[PDB]
Amino acid sequence: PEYDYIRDGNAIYERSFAIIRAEADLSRFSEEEADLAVRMVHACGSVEATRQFVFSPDFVSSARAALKAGAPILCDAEMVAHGVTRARLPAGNEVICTLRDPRTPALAAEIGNTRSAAALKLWSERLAGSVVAIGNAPTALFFLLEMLRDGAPKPAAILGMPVGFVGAAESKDALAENSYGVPFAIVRGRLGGSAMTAAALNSLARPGL
Amino acid sequence: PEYDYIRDGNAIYERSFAIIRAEADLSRFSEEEADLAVRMVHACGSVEATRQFVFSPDFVSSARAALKAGAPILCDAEMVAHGVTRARLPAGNEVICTLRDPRTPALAAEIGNTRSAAALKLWSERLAGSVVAIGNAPTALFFLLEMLRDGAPKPAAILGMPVGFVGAAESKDALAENSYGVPFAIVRGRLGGSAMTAAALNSLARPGL
Structure with missing residues (x-):
């Protein structure tokens, strides 16, 4: 029983992108x-999934400029942070996720919110000009909107891609309704997730293969 | 602009599972x-996605028994390993991914195969009785089948869920055709991925919320 498959790593990415191009409706992007x-x-x-992707007008430009400028990528979840191929980042961009910072649970408890949300209080210094990747937690997305509403400094771009059945679609909708002036990209509805978010970041980092 | 959303973490998982139960066709499982x-x-x-899930007859029993027995979870990708909520594992099960082991590139090169595949040569000691989670790389899945064919010791269960357009469906099909006697679970076609794989592991680890 001889298994026949491409044993070549580059050949695999190459055929996969060739295949996605050949089957994916990409014309509206x-x-x-x-x-x-x-x-x-x-x-x-x-x-x-492409049918659910929404990139505000200057989302890629501003998010790619931010990254080329050295802007950190604030991530709501470690998974997103793990999917970011560092060798791709343009300017030794930092990939920060504070979800696991020891003060997060404490904060979530004091504020009456999720850990994913509360973590964003730890973003403070870095928020300005950053690229926010919200790949998993909708409450982190809503919380970021409350911080923005309440005068927080603005990120250069927000990847609003939390996946989920609770608050995922609405948080992304809230983002699209008023992102307080920040370019955004969302995956409409319940789809999203850290792999797709990180993929998005990967491509933002460096376009093409 | 008052954002109204569940700020409660447990309430979020609770509503999400209630919602998936209410919308997901689960009867055939x-x-x-x-x-x-x-x-x-x-x-x-x-x-x-549920339409694409396939659990061999004793997949959950044997994979849950293996885990309760202390069986390690061999993962093709770190992402899978990262999605495994450790506090859920039953018996301080190890979650091994050797994809990043320094000898992997070397091996991939000598064998003429992908890093994901070659890494599995580093599984040797642990293969027997383990729970294999292949959440990303199809070549790791084909390679595991070649090792099995060629007399390698058998895992207690194989989560064959690599996602992708190249080899993903076929590797999972090969698994289902002859898994050399090992219970398996696959996500048919191109769907799969580390989040879903880790979710699968999480549930195997501990059923329910």
Whole structure:
């Protein structure tokens, strides 16, 4: 029983992107956004997810500029942070997730909110000009909107891609309604997740293969 | 602008599982398998993914027994390993991923295969009786089948859930055709991925919320 498969790593990424291009409806995206689209599709294995992707007008430019500028990537979840291929980052960008910071549970408890949300209080210094990747927790997304509403400094771009059935769609909708002036990208509805978010970051970091 | 959302972490998991139960077709799974199904759906946000889940007859029993027995979870990718909520493991089960072991690139090069695949040569001692979680790399799955064919000791269960467009479906199909006598669980077609795989592991570790 001889298994026949591509044993070549690069050949695998190459055929996979060739395949996603050949099956994915990418016409409504800019060339640049399509790049994110493909990697994102690469990451979830679902070519149809593209129908749910929404990139505000200057989302990739501003988020790519921020990253090239050295802007940190604030992540709501470690998984997102783990999916970020560092060798791809342009400027030794930091990938911060404070979800696991020891003060997070304490904060979540004092504020009456989730750990994912409360963690964002620990973003303070870094919020300004950052690229926010919210790949998992909707409450982190709503919380970021409350901080923005209440005068918090603004991120250069917000990847609003929490996945889920509770608050995921609405938080992303709230983002799209008024992101307080910050370019955004969302995956509509319940889809999203850290793999797709990290893919998105990966492509933002460096377009193409 | 008052954002109204559940600020309660447990309430969020609670409503999400209640929602997945209410929308997900779970009838063809056993009660036990449905548990995996829900968490898996929880993880990708897609209730329809359940249509692609396949649990061999004794997959959950043997994989849950293995884990309760203290069996390690061999993972093809770190992401899978990161999604495994340790506090859930039953018996201080080890979660091994050797994808990043320094000898992996070397091996991939000598064998003429991917790093994900070659890494599995480093599984040797642990393979027997383990629970294999292949959440990302199809070549790791094919390679595991070649090791099994060629006399390698058998895992107690194999989660064959690599996601992808190249080799993902076929490797999972090969698994289902002849897993060399090992219970398996696959996510048919291109869907799969580390979040869903880890969810699967999480549920195997401890059923329910």
